Protein backbone atom coordinates (compact mmCIF):
# COMPACT_ATOMS: atom_id res chain seq x y z
CA UNK A 1 0.00 0.00 0.00
CA UNK A 2 3.02 2.27 -0.21
CA UNK A 3 3.25 2.17 -4.06
CA UNK A 4 0.84 2.81 -6.89
CA UNK A 5 0.66 1.21 -10.36
CA UNK A 6 1.26 3.70 -13.21
CA UNK A 7 3.36 4.16 -16.36
CA UNK A 8 6.87 5.63 -15.87
CA UNK A 9 8.37 8.45 -18.00
CA UNK A 10 11.95 9.67 -18.42
CA UNK A 11 12.79 12.69 -16.28
CA UNK A 12 13.37 15.87 -18.22
CA UNK A 13 14.90 17.40 -15.09
CA UNK A 14 17.68 16.02 -12.88
CA UNK A 15 16.69 18.47 -10.01
CA UNK A 16 13.56 19.22 -7.92
CA UNK A 17 13.51 22.55 -6.13
CA UNK A 18 17.32 22.66 -6.02
CA UNK A 19 17.74 19.04 -4.92
CA UNK A 20 19.52 16.64 -7.29
CA UNK A 21 17.47 13.56 -7.94
CA UNK A 22 19.00 10.09 -7.60
CA UNK A 23 16.54 8.57 -10.04
CA UNK A 24 15.82 8.98 -13.79
CA UNK A 25 12.14 8.05 -14.10
CA UNK A 26 8.94 9.62 -12.78
CA UNK A 27 5.14 9.88 -13.23
CA UNK A 28 2.52 12.64 -13.03
CA UNK A 29 -0.24 10.48 -11.54
CA UNK A 30 0.14 11.90 -8.00
CA UNK A 31 -0.10 15.56 -9.10
CA UNK A 32 -3.71 16.09 -10.24
CA UNK A 33 -2.94 19.65 -11.31
CA UNK A 34 -0.28 18.51 -13.81
CA UNK A 35 -0.43 16.45 -17.00
CA UNK A 36 3.15 17.09 -18.12
CA UNK A 37 6.58 17.46 -16.52
CA UNK A 38 6.46 21.04 -17.90
CA UNK A 39 3.27 21.82 -15.90
CA UNK A 40 4.78 20.18 -12.80
CA UNK A 41 7.90 22.34 -13.27
CA UNK A 42 5.75 25.52 -13.47
CA UNK A 43 3.67 24.48 -10.45
CA UNK A 44 6.77 23.87 -8.33
CA UNK A 45 8.22 27.26 -9.23
CA UNK A 46 4.92 28.73 -7.98
CA UNK A 47 5.25 26.75 -4.75
CA UNK A 48 8.82 27.97 -4.19
CA UNK A 49 7.31 31.23 -2.78
CA UNK A 50 7.36 29.34 0.50
CA UNK A 51 11.25 29.51 0.51
CA UNK A 52 10.70 32.72 2.40
CA UNK A 53 9.26 30.66 5.30
CA UNK A 54 12.14 28.30 6.07
CA UNK A 55 10.29 26.34 8.74
CA UNK A 56 7.58 25.58 6.20
CA UNK A 57 10.04 25.08 3.34
CA UNK A 58 12.29 22.56 5.10
CA UNK A 59 9.22 20.24 5.38
CA UNK A 60 7.23 21.22 2.28
CA UNK A 61 10.09 20.88 -0.16
CA UNK A 62 10.59 17.16 0.30
CA UNK A 63 6.76 16.74 0.10
CA UNK A 64 6.35 18.68 -3.11
CA UNK A 65 9.11 16.64 -4.74
CA UNK A 66 7.51 13.38 -3.66
CA UNK A 67 4.22 14.51 -5.27
CA UNK A 68 5.37 16.34 -8.41
CA UNK A 69 8.52 14.38 -9.40
CA UNK A 70 8.30 11.10 -7.49
CA UNK A 71 10.53 8.15 -8.30
CA UNK A 72 8.94 5.66 -10.67
CA UNK A 73 10.66 2.23 -11.19
CA UNK A 74 9.21 -0.89 -12.70
CA UNK A 75 5.74 0.58 -13.33
CA UNK A 76 5.36 1.77 -9.76
CA UNK A 77 5.47 5.18 -8.12
CA UNK A 78 6.44 5.66 -4.51
CA UNK A 79 3.83 7.43 -2.41
CA UNK A 80 4.66 10.24 0.02
CA UNK A 81 4.38 9.26 3.69
CA UNK A 82 1.90 10.44 6.33
CA UNK A 83 4.64 11.93 8.63
CA UNK A 84 5.81 13.90 5.57
CA UNK A 85 2.50 15.53 4.92
CA UNK A 86 1.57 16.10 8.62
CA UNK A 87 4.81 17.95 9.44
CA UNK A 88 3.83 20.62 6.90
CA UNK A 89 0.30 21.46 8.19
CA UNK A 90 1.22 23.80 11.05
CA UNK A 91 4.34 25.51 9.63
CA UNK A 92 2.65 25.92 6.19
CA UNK A 93 -0.77 26.91 7.65
CA UNK A 94 -0.63 30.15 5.57
CA UNK A 95 -1.30 28.00 2.51
CA UNK A 96 -4.76 27.14 3.84
CA UNK A 97 -5.51 30.83 4.29
CA UNK A 98 -4.21 31.99 0.92
CA UNK A 99 -5.27 29.22 -1.46
CA UNK A 100 -6.04 25.96 0.36
CA UNK A 101 -4.52 22.52 -0.21
CA UNK A 102 -5.75 20.62 -3.28
CA UNK A 103 -7.04 17.05 -2.83
CA UNK A 104 -3.73 15.48 -3.70
CA UNK A 105 -1.92 17.51 -0.99
CA UNK A 106 -4.31 16.80 1.87
CA UNK A 107 -2.87 14.50 4.51
CA UNK A 108 -6.35 12.98 4.91
CA UNK A 109 -6.11 11.38 1.49
CA UNK A 110 -4.82 8.06 2.82
CA UNK A 111 -4.64 6.64 -0.71
CA UNK A 112 -1.97 9.25 -1.35
CA UNK A 113 -0.31 9.52 2.07
CA UNK A 114 -0.16 6.08 3.66
CA UNK A 115 1.16 5.57 7.21
CA UNK A 116 3.97 4.81 7.28
CA UNK A 117 6.78 4.51 4.71
NA1 LIG B 1 -1.29 14.33 -13.42
ZN1 LIG C 1 15.77 5.57 -18.08
Beta strands in the chain (DSSP E): 3-5, 9-10, 15-16, 19-20, 25-26, 72-73, 76-78
Measured between alpha carbons, how far is 27 from 3 in angstroms, rounded to an integer?
12
Strand partners, 77: 4, 72
Pairwise CA distance, residues 36 & 29, whole Å: 10
Contact 93, 58 (CB under 8 A): no
> How many whole angstroms from 57 Cα to the centroid of ligand 1?
23
Ligand approaching nearest to the C-alpha of 102: 1
Domains of the chain: 1-117 (1.10.2000.10)
Q: How far is the CA of 25 from the centre of ligand 2 (A)?
A: 6
**Resolution in units of Å:** 2.3
Amino acid sequence: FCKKSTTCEVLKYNTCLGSPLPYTHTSLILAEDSETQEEAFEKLAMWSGLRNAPRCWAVIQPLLCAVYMPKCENGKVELPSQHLCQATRNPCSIVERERGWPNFLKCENKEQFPKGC
